[PDB]
Design a protein around this ligand. Structure first.
Ligand SMILES: N[C@@H](CCC(=O)N[C@@H](CS)C(=O)NCC(=O)O)C(=O)O
Ligand SMILES: [Cl-]
Ligand SMILES: [Fe+3]
Length: 350
């Protein structure tokens, strides 16, 4: 009913595109092809957008990366969805041709598009302005057809029957690109795809694919068994969360209840430290511009929380401390301003 929230995310290691969709009317969301290494990033992004993740959806059983479907299920309670035809065990919902994956007022429709694997699906947005083609159709290309259940004939018929029948202007988002491309469309691939577009026939395409010899994915021996189980098999010195920017944040309530358990490093200027906002009791003053050169005064025996006026300069303090070998470091988000606004203890205030 209202605007669609859409985010394309890239995993540099496997060149995988993850896709986040959500209805802004209800903030309910789905996530297509989440990457295991990217679980903290993806979950942080969902949190910062105020979203509720109903489903992870895997287009097929991947050979190049372990999916995040299980880790996200465990951590934020999202449901695992994958095709029935893929044969993976441990999912909450098996998908078949014509299934409708709802999120709020919006939905995706499932189209079976095997060829790369016999479980590949393509997800079509309700208004058919975009679709997610997994490794079936790629940007000016296709998925490989040469391992296990791969079949070039099946892929050709899938692309022509299920994808080239979408609207001409419909955008197509693939699970991978290796040249820095992000999207294509039905019209472009139908006309310019060099393997099965234009006037190429089924025989032309299969002859191409039977002579395409690509190295196996680097993670193949690890990923496919892991993904047949939907991705089955973390600082704990304080309750920590990692922001989308990548900064480790401490829970302020826990910090006030355990100030003796940590070293508190105030990176403000000397005037701010003795100034009207006050300081957190027992806070060590090492101004940010002095911090890098004085890291030998802090002990690795005890974790370190950085504080500044509003949490900005202290976030940068965490990066400097990590680059100097410190591991148990965290930022106090919102800084002295939020500490005071939440009525927490300060010395020398006003
Ligand atoms: N070198 C890549 C593997 C490249 C590859 O084979 N990607 C697959 C996706 S599972 C494909 O089907 N086609 C690649 C292409 O057509 O260039 C990696 O280690 O991840
Ligand atoms: Cl600040
Ligand atoms: Fe694949």
């Amino acid at each position: 009913s209202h605007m669609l929230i859409f985010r394309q995310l890239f995993d540099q290691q496997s060149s995988t595109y993850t896709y986040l969709l959500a209805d802004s009317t209800t903030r309910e969301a789905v996530l297509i092809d989440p990457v295991f290494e990217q679980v903290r990033r993806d979950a942080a992004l969902i949190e910062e957008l105020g979203l509720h993740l109903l489903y992870t959806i895997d287009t097929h059983v991947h050979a190049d990366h372990v999916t995040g479907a299980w880790m996200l299920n465990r951590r934020i309670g999202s449901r695992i969805a994958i095709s029935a035809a893929s044969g993976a065990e441990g999912a909450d919902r098996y998908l078949s041709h014509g299934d409708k994956v709802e999120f709020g007022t919006r939905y995706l429709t499932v189209r079976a598009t095997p060829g790369h694997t016999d479980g590949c699906i393509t997800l079509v947005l309700d208004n058919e302005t975009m679709a997610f083609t997994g490794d079936c159709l790629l940007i000016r290309g296709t998925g490989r057809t040469d391992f296990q259940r791969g079949d070039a004939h099946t892929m050709f018929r899938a692309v022509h029957g299920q994808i080239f029948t979408l609207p001409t202007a419909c955008l197509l988002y693939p699970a991978h690109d290796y040249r820095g491309l992000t999207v294509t469309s039905v019209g472009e691939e139908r006309r310019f795809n060099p393997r099965l577009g234009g006037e190429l026939c089924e025989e032309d395409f299969t002859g191409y694919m039977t002579n395409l010899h690509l190295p196996h994915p680097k993670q193949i021996d690890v990923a496919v068994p892991a993904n047949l189980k939907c991705g089955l098999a973390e600082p704990d010195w304080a309750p920590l969360t990692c922001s989308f920017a990548g900064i480790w944040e401490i829970n302020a309530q826990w910090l006030e209840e355990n100030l003796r358990a940590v070293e508190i490093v105030d990176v403000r200027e000397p005037e701010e430290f003795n100034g009207p906002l006050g300081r957190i009791p027992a806070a060590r003053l090492i101004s940010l511009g002095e911090l890098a050169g004085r890291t030998a005064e802090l002990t690795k025996d005890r974790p370190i929380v950085t504080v500044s006026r509003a949490g900005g300069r202290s976030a940068q303090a965490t990066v400097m401390l990590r680059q100097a070998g410190f591991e148990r470091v965290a930022n106090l988000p919102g800084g002295m301003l939020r500490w005071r606004a939440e009525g927490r203890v300060v010395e020398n205030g006003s």
